[PDB]
Structure 1
């Protein structure tokens, strides 16, 4: 399992799940990472996503209640089922596109964490769930500078150690 998300300096993800900040660069990064790999998106994500489903990619819509249904992404209401699905396709890695509730559910059993940090700050009604940084040790990171400081962002990857 892999964690793919973007956050500001303060620690907020956005509003209603949708990224309030328009960073075509960071957005490009998310899209590129989900190419040729299995990704899981929460129900809130299904509505927050810009356009689904993606081509040449495997998208999955995960919700707490089985009443909910999603188009373009496989709908799974079983936490165990999501793990098994990734297990079935060892060739393709599983990445959690969100949301935070989804992240929390699989946060404990994640080996790779991807985080995007923005120098600028944004305000919204949705904040990212707490993470244990000390438990995970950063393996590598990349820094990209945009025209505007707020726009400028960096990519950091953490791997769980035991």
Structure 2
């Protein structure tokens, strides 16, 4: 199970229910990373997608609303249902795409971090959950420079030590 997120230099991930930046490169990397997999997102991050569901991947939406409707998405209500779905699934990798409340609900079962680090600093209200960095190794790092230098970013892959 992977977590996939983008954060500024201080860890910021969101502002007013939306992204605090607009960084197309990162969105085509998101898609690369989630097409074909089981993609888990919290109800509020799902309602912020411009097309719901996002196509070519299983969107699982985590909601406490018993009645919620999301045509074409897998609507569950606790973490045990996510993993009961993933157990049925097998051959699709599970990727937790946010936001903060869902990262906290899977904080013990993630093995890989797919982090995009922005060089700048943005204003918002939601930060990435604290994680033990010391328990992971950075395996891969690729940097993309943008003409807004706040937007220059690094894609890192981190994998959990034995």
TM-score, length-scaled by structure 1: 0.92
Structure 2 portions without partners, runs of 5+ = none
Q: Distance in 1 between matches of 2:161 and 2:51?
A: 35
CA-CA distance at 1:78 after TM superposition:
2.3
CA-CA distance at 1:23 after TM superposition:
0.6
Count of equivalent residues: 162
TM-superposition CA deviations, 1:54-93 (whole Å, max 9, x none) = 2222111012443544333211112112112222222111
Contact 1:17/1:99 (<8 A) preserved? no
Contact 1:41/1:61 (<8 A) preserved? yes
CA-CA distance at 1:31 after TM superposition:
1.6
TM-superposition CA deviations, 1:37-70 (whole Å, max 9, x none) = 1101101112222221122221110124435443
TM-score, length-scaled by structure 2: 0.92
Q: Distance in 1 between matches of 2:130 and 2:17?
A: 16
Structure 1 portions without partners, runs of 5+ = none
Q: Distance in 1 between matches of 2:128 and 2:144?
A: 22
Q: CA RMSD in A?
A: 1.5
CA-CA distance at 1:17 after TM superposition:
3.8
Q: Distance in 2 between matches of 1:36 and 1:89?
A: 11
